[PDB]
mmCIF file of C-alpha atoms in Angstrom:
data_model
loop_
_atom_site.group_PDB
_atom_site.id
_atom_site.type_symbol
_atom_site.label_atom_id
_atom_site.label_comp_id
_atom_site.label_asym_id
_atom_site.label_seq_id
_atom_site.Cartn_x
_atom_site.Cartn_y
_atom_site.Cartn_z
ATOM 1 C CA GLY A 1 -79.191 -115.599 14.515
ATOM 2 C CA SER A 2 -80.753 -118.405 12.201
ATOM 3 C CA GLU A 3 -80.040 -121.286 14.737
ATOM 4 C CA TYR A 4 -81.593 -119.112 17.699
ATOM 5 C CA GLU A 5 -84.475 -118.204 15.499
ATOM 6 C CA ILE A 6 -85.069 -121.586 14.399
ATOM 7 C CA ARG A 7 -84.820 -122.977 18.000
ATOM 8 C CA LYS A 8 -87.444 -120.625 19.230
ATOM 9 C CA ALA A 9 -89.908 -121.320 16.585
ATOM 10 C CA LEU A 10 -89.573 -124.575 17.299
ATOM 11 C CA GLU A 11 -90.395 -124.403 20.988
ATOM 12 C CA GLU A 12 -93.202 -122.509 19.843
ATOM 13 C CA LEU A 13 -94.489 -125.232 17.794
ATOM 14 C CA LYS A 14 -94.234 -127.472 20.824
ATOM 15 C CA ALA A 15 -96.480 -125.553 22.765
ATOM 16 C CA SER A 16 -99.073 -125.133 20.196
ATOM 17 C CA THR A 17 -98.796 -128.604 19.689
ATOM 18 C CA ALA A 18 -99.376 -129.222 23.589
ATOM 19 C CA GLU A 19 -102.800 -126.809 23.422
ATOM 20 C CA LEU A 20 -103.734 -129.337 20.187
ATOM 21 C CA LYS A 21 -103.727 -132.366 22.630
ATOM 22 C CA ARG A 22 -105.446 -130.695 25.382
ATOM 23 C CA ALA A 23 -108.017 -129.727 22.714
ATOM 24 C CA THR A 24 -108.395 -132.691 21.210
ATOM 25 C CA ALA A 25 -108.703 -134.566 24.421
ATOM 26 C CA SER A 26 -111.399 -132.265 25.178
ATOM 27 C CA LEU A 27 -113.085 -132.483 21.910
ATOM 28 C CA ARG A 28 -113.256 -136.416 21.999
ATOM 29 C CA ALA A 29 -114.665 -136.167 25.346
ATOM 30 C CA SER A 30 -117.748 -133.777 24.271
ATOM 31 C CA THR A 31 -118.168 -136.068 21.095
ATOM 32 C CA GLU A 32 -118.621 -139.007 23.962
ATOM 33 C CA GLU A 33 -121.200 -137.259 25.667
ATOM 34 C CA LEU A 34 -122.628 -136.111 22.641
ATOM 35 C CA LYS A 35 -123.871 -139.176 21.271
ATOM 36 C CA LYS A 36 -124.755 -140.521 24.656
ATOM 37 C CA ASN A 37 -126.782 -138.063 25.249
ATOM 38 C CA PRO A 38 -127.904 -136.231 21.863
ATOM 39 C CA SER A 39 -129.653 -132.828 21.962
ATOM 40 C CA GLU A 40 -129.772 -129.439 20.116
ATOM 41 C CA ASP A 41 -127.806 -127.842 22.653
ATOM 42 C CA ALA A 42 -125.183 -130.790 22.775
ATOM 43 C CA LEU A 43 -124.567 -130.362 19.165
ATOM 44 C CA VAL A 44 -124.214 -126.697 19.206
ATOM 45 C CA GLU A 45 -121.958 -127.004 22.115
ATOM 46 C CA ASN A 46 -119.945 -129.876 20.324
ATOM 47 C CA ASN A 47 -119.568 -127.610 17.150
ATOM 48 C CA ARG A 48 -117.795 -124.969 19.264
ATOM 49 C CA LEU A 49 -115.439 -127.106 20.516
ATOM 50 C CA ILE A 50 -114.797 -128.336 17.090
ATOM 51 C CA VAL A 51 -114.183 -124.433 16.095
ATOM 52 C CA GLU A 52 -111.934 -124.015 18.829
ATOM 53 C CA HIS A 53 -109.855 -127.162 17.682
ATOM 54 C CA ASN A 54 -109.899 -126.224 13.986
ATOM 55 C CA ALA A 55 -108.321 -122.808 15.364
ATOM 56 C CA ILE A 56 -105.649 -124.558 17.301
ATOM 57 C CA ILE A 57 -104.604 -126.262 14.110
ATOM 58 C CA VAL A 58 -104.469 -123.124 12.270
ATOM 59 C CA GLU A 59 -102.012 -121.655 14.693
ATOM 60 C CA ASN A 60 -99.984 -124.862 14.571
ATOM 61 C CA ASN A 61 -99.983 -124.434 10.737
ATOM 62 C CA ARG A 62 -99.035 -120.895 11.082
ATOM 63 C CA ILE A 63 -95.798 -122.062 12.910
ATOM 64 C CA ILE A 64 -94.944 -124.777 10.809
ATOM 65 C CA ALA A 65 -95.004 -122.144 7.723
ATOM 66 C CA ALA A 66 -92.607 -119.903 9.811
ATOM 67 C CA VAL A 67 -90.453 -122.734 10.438
ATOM 68 C CA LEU A 68 -90.128 -123.578 6.787
ATOM 69 C CA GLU A 69 -89.323 -119.935 5.828
ATOM 70 C CA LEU A 70 -86.725 -119.949 8.386
ATOM 71 C CA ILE A 71 -84.993 -123.111 7.273
ATOM 72 C CA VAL A 72 -85.086 -121.984 3.504
ATOM 73 C CA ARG A 73 -83.316 -118.993 4.407
ATOM 74 C CA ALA A 74 -80.652 -120.932 6.545
ATOM 75 C CA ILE A 75 -79.941 -123.311 3.634
ATOM 76 C CA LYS A 76 -79.293 -120.416 1.257
ATOM 77 C CA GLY B 1 -84.066 -128.765 -4.794
ATOM 78 C CA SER B 2 -83.929 -125.552 -7.025
ATOM 79 C CA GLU B 3 -84.365 -122.251 -4.990
ATOM 80 C CA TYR B 4 -87.150 -121.475 -7.723
ATOM 81 C CA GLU B 5 -89.493 -124.290 -7.116
ATOM 82 C CA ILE B 6 -89.073 -123.738 -3.097
ATOM 83 C CA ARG B 7 -89.720 -120.368 -3.570
ATOM 84 C CA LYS B 8 -92.598 -120.809 -5.718
ATOM 85 C CA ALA B 9 -93.993 -123.464 -3.372
ATOM 86 C CA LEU B 10 -93.981 -121.141 -0.431
ATOM 87 C CA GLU B 11 -95.685 -118.614 -2.051
ATOM 88 C CA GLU B 12 -98.744 -121.064 -2.783
ATOM 89 C CA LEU B 13 -98.518 -121.916 0.905
ATOM 90 C CA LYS B 14 -99.004 -118.350 1.623
ATOM 91 C CA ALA B 15 -102.122 -118.155 -0.685
ATOM 92 C CA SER B 16 -103.660 -121.145 1.161
ATOM 93 C CA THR B 17 -102.882 -119.867 4.198
ATOM 94 C CA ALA B 18 -104.677 -116.674 3.173
ATOM 95 C CA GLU B 19 -107.844 -118.954 2.270
ATOM 96 C CA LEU B 20 -107.526 -120.464 5.609
ATOM 97 C CA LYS B 21 -107.996 -116.981 7.365
ATOM 98 C CA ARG B 22 -110.849 -116.121 5.118
ATOM 99 C CA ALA B 23 -112.466 -119.362 6.294
ATOM 100 C CA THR B 24 -111.696 -119.123 9.969
ATOM 101 C CA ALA B 25 -113.305 -115.879 10.218
ATOM 102 C CA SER B 26 -116.257 -116.998 8.291
ATOM 103 C CA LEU B 27 -116.597 -119.948 10.421
ATOM 104 C CA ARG B 28 -116.269 -117.948 13.725
ATOM 105 C CA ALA B 29 -118.857 -115.535 12.505
ATOM 106 C CA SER B 30 -121.262 -118.090 11.749
ATOM 107 C CA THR B 31 -120.602 -119.931 15.182
ATOM 108 C CA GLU B 32 -121.892 -116.734 16.612
ATOM 109 C CA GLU B 33 -124.944 -117.217 14.944
ATOM 110 C CA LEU B 34 -125.373 -120.630 15.583
ATOM 111 C CA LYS B 35 -125.336 -120.210 18.995
ATOM 112 C CA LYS B 36 -127.377 -117.174 18.970
ATOM 113 C CA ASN B 37 -130.296 -118.777 17.195
ATOM 114 C CA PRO B 38 -129.440 -122.679 17.192
ATOM 115 C CA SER B 39 -131.768 -124.805 14.808
ATOM 116 C CA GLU B 40 -131.539 -127.728 12.673
ATOM 117 C CA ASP B 41 -130.710 -125.745 9.486
ATOM 118 C CA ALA B 42 -127.973 -123.470 11.514
ATOM 119 C CA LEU B 43 -126.443 -126.585 12.494
ATOM 120 C CA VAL B 44 -126.320 -128.230 9.334
ATOM 121 C CA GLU B 45 -125.037 -124.533 7.780
ATOM 122 C CA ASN B 46 -122.515 -124.787 10.416
ATOM 123 C CA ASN B 47 -121.046 -128.242 9.651
ATOM 124 C CA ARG B 48 -120.848 -127.234 6.073
ATOM 125 C CA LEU B 49 -118.803 -124.174 6.731
ATOM 126 C CA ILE B 50 -116.556 -126.397 9.291
ATOM 127 C CA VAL B 51 -116.186 -129.121 6.446
ATOM 128 C CA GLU B 52 -114.845 -126.367 4.140
ATOM 129 C CA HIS B 53 -112.619 -125.223 6.629
ATOM 130 C CA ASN B 54 -111.164 -128.620 7.229
ATOM 131 C CA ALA B 55 -110.537 -129.153 3.677
ATOM 132 C CA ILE B 56 -108.501 -125.786 3.322
ATOM 133 C CA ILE B 57 -106.427 -126.909 6.193
ATOM 134 C CA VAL B 58 -105.890 -130.080 4.330
ATOM 135 C CA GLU B 59 -104.575 -128.371 1.116
ATOM 136 C CA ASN B 60 -102.437 -126.073 3.556
ATOM 137 C CA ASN B 61 -100.888 -129.597 4.900
ATOM 138 C CA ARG B 62 -100.408 -130.714 1.346
ATOM 139 C CA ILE B 63 -98.497 -127.800 0.246
ATOM 140 C CA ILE B 64 -96.222 -128.105 3.396
ATOM 141 C CA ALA B 65 -95.676 -131.789 2.907
ATOM 142 C CA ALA B 66 -94.496 -130.735 -0.746
ATOM 143 C CA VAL B 67 -92.076 -127.705 0.632
ATOM 144 C CA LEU B 68 -90.550 -130.358 3.461
ATOM 145 C CA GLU B 69 -89.683 -132.918 0.245
ATOM 146 C CA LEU B 70 -88.221 -130.044 -1.583
ATOM 147 C CA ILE B 71 -86.003 -128.862 1.327
ATOM 148 C CA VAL B 72 -85.074 -132.823 1.815
ATOM 149 C CA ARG B 73 -83.741 -132.685 -1.587
ATOM 150 C CA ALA B 74 -82.118 -129.399 -1.504
ATOM 151 C CA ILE B 75 -79.875 -130.473 1.229
ATOM 152 C CA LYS B 76 -78.657 -133.627 0.200
ATOM 153 C CA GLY C 1 -78.898 -141.996 10.139
ATOM 154 C CA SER C 2 -80.153 -138.372 9.220
ATOM 155 C CA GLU C 3 -80.755 -139.082 5.730
ATOM 156 C CA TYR C 4 -82.699 -142.568 6.760
ATOM 157 C CA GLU C 5 -84.657 -141.233 9.501
ATOM 158 C CA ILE C 6 -85.756 -138.420 7.026
ATOM 159 C CA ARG C 7 -86.689 -140.914 4.328
ATOM 160 C CA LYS C 8 -88.451 -142.930 6.687
ATOM 161 C CA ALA C 9 -90.480 -140.104 8.505
ATOM 162 C CA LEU C 10 -91.570 -138.650 5.117
ATOM 163 C CA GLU C 11 -92.958 -142.090 4.119
ATOM 164 C CA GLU C 12 -94.883 -142.054 7.319
ATOM 165 C CA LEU C 13 -96.114 -138.314 6.505
ATOM 166 C CA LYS C 14 -97.503 -139.848 3.016
ATOM 167 C CA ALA C 15 -99.103 -142.505 4.719
ATOM 168 C CA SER C 16 -101.071 -140.060 6.981
ATOM 169 C CA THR C 17 -101.599 -137.961 3.926
ATOM 170 C CA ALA C 18 -103.319 -140.833 2.573
ATOM 171 C CA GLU C 19 -105.706 -141.513 5.450
ATOM 172 C CA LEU C 20 -106.155 -137.755 5.228
ATOM 173 C CA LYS C 21 -107.361 -138.177 1.651
ATOM 174 C CA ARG C 22 -109.814 -141.215 2.598
ATOM 175 C CA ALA C 23 -111.270 -139.188 5.521
ATOM 176 C CA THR C 24 -112.036 -135.956 3.613
ATOM 177 C CA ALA C 25 -113.545 -138.173 1.088
ATOM 178 C CA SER C 26 -115.665 -139.830 3.497
ATOM 179 C CA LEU C 27 -116.440 -136.720 5.511
ATOM 180 C CA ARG C 28 -117.533 -134.961 2.517
ATOM 181 C CA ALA C 29 -120.312 -137.730 1.741
ATOM 182 C CA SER C 30 -121.971 -137.864 4.712
ATOM 183 C CA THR C 31 -121.835 -133.772 4.545
ATOM 184 C CA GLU C 32 -123.842 -134.415 1.457
ATOM 185 C CA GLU C 33 -126.379 -137.018 2.753
ATOM 186 C CA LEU C 34 -126.961 -134.489 5.815
ATOM 187 C CA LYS C 35 -127.811 -131.723 3.796
ATOM 188 C CA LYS C 36 -130.001 -134.250 1.853
ATOM 189 C CA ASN C 37 -132.033 -135.661 4.859
ATOM 190 C CA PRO C 38 -131.034 -133.442 7.901
ATOM 191 C CA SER C 39 -131.795 -134.786 11.305
ATOM 192 C CA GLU C 40 -130.412 -134.995 14.830
ATOM 193 C CA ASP C 41 -128.752 -138.476 14.448
ATOM 194 C CA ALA C 42 -127.390 -137.201 11.056
ATOM 195 C CA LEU C 43 -125.624 -134.201 12.735
ATOM 196 C CA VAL C 44 -124.300 -136.382 15.265
ATOM 197 C CA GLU C 45 -123.051 -138.858 12.668
ATOM 198 C CA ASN C 46 -121.462 -135.940 10.690
ATOM 199 C CA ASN C 47 -119.944 -134.672 13.916
ATOM 200 C CA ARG C 48 -118.569 -137.832 14.450
ATOM 201 C CA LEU C 49 -116.832 -138.142 11.299
ATOM 202 C CA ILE C 50 -115.439 -134.532 11.607
ATOM 203 C CA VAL C 51 -113.691 -135.338 14.835
ATOM 204 C CA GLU C 52 -112.324 -138.265 13.131
ATOM 205 C CA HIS C 53 -111.045 -136.130 10.149
ATOM 206 C CA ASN C 54 -109.683 -133.614 12.536
ATOM 207 C CA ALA C 55 -107.974 -136.175 14.564
ATOM 208 C CA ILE C 56 -106.102 -137.495 11.156
ATOM 209 C CA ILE C 57 -104.747 -133.906 10.591
ATOM 210 C CA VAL C 58 -103.283 -133.671 14.237
ATOM 211 C CA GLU C 59 -101.373 -136.877 13.385
ATOM 212 C CA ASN C 60 -100.298 -135.369 10.010
ATOM 213 C CA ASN C 61 -99.027 -132.317 11.501
ATOM 214 C CA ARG C 62 -97.520 -134.404 14.278
ATOM 215 C CA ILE C 63 -95.357 -136.071 11.577
ATOM 216 C CA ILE C 64 -94.833 -132.844 9.926
ATOM 217 C CA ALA C 65 -93.164 -131.246 13.499
ATOM 218 C CA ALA C 66 -91.037 -134.376 13.387
ATOM 219 C CA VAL C 67 -89.430 -133.892 10.106
ATOM 220 C CA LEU C 68 -89.061 -130.424 10.803
ATOM 221 C CA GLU C 69 -86.927 -131.349 13.603
ATOM 222 C CA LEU C 70 -85.243 -133.873 11.547
ATOM 223 C CA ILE C 71 -84.186 -131.343 9.051
ATOM 224 C CA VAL C 72 -83.200 -128.731 11.636
ATOM 225 C CA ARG C 73 -80.608 -131.436 12.888
ATOM 226 C CA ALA C 74 -79.354 -132.396 9.473
ATOM 227 C CA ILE C 75 -78.624 -128.553 8.616
ATOM 228 C CA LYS C 76 -76.579 -127.951 11.702
#
């Protein structure tokens, strides 16, 4: 049913939001170490963490878009 | 408000979501080449791809916000 | 009330979207300066701006998720 599917998708959004925090923290830390001890490797490692962070945002947006579609169906 | 405007906005969101996919994949491909052959230019090119990727996310979020506003009007 | 809380949350979202604009512009500017005069420092500074930009996106998604939860409660 619509209420169940929406509840499930929202719980999914919570989980994704949770990874996003752990990633944001992990990323803010590397950026701290990067500026403190800059180097080519430090830059590449920081870029890799940024990409991992962007991809988590993308998953977050994917779930948001799924919730929007479910809400639009529910209010029809 | 209208079912038509929401339908159209959700189709917009899908188009933006599609760019995001093409951008996320291409970003990950470049990140692979970066780690394989790190260099000044490799890093700079990687940053450019990340910025283009973040800008697509921003557009995605913009459409999400428009859909939210339309839903809020429709349910009043 | 539901209508008030949703109105307030959307105003929050708009303020965050505004911050996102200012970050996107400032970020793209550094990316222009970076490619023109690349250097280790230029790269580290660009990475800092990108992270600050990603963090605003995260705030934006946070508000979006709050609005979704308010809408789901309003249509029950």
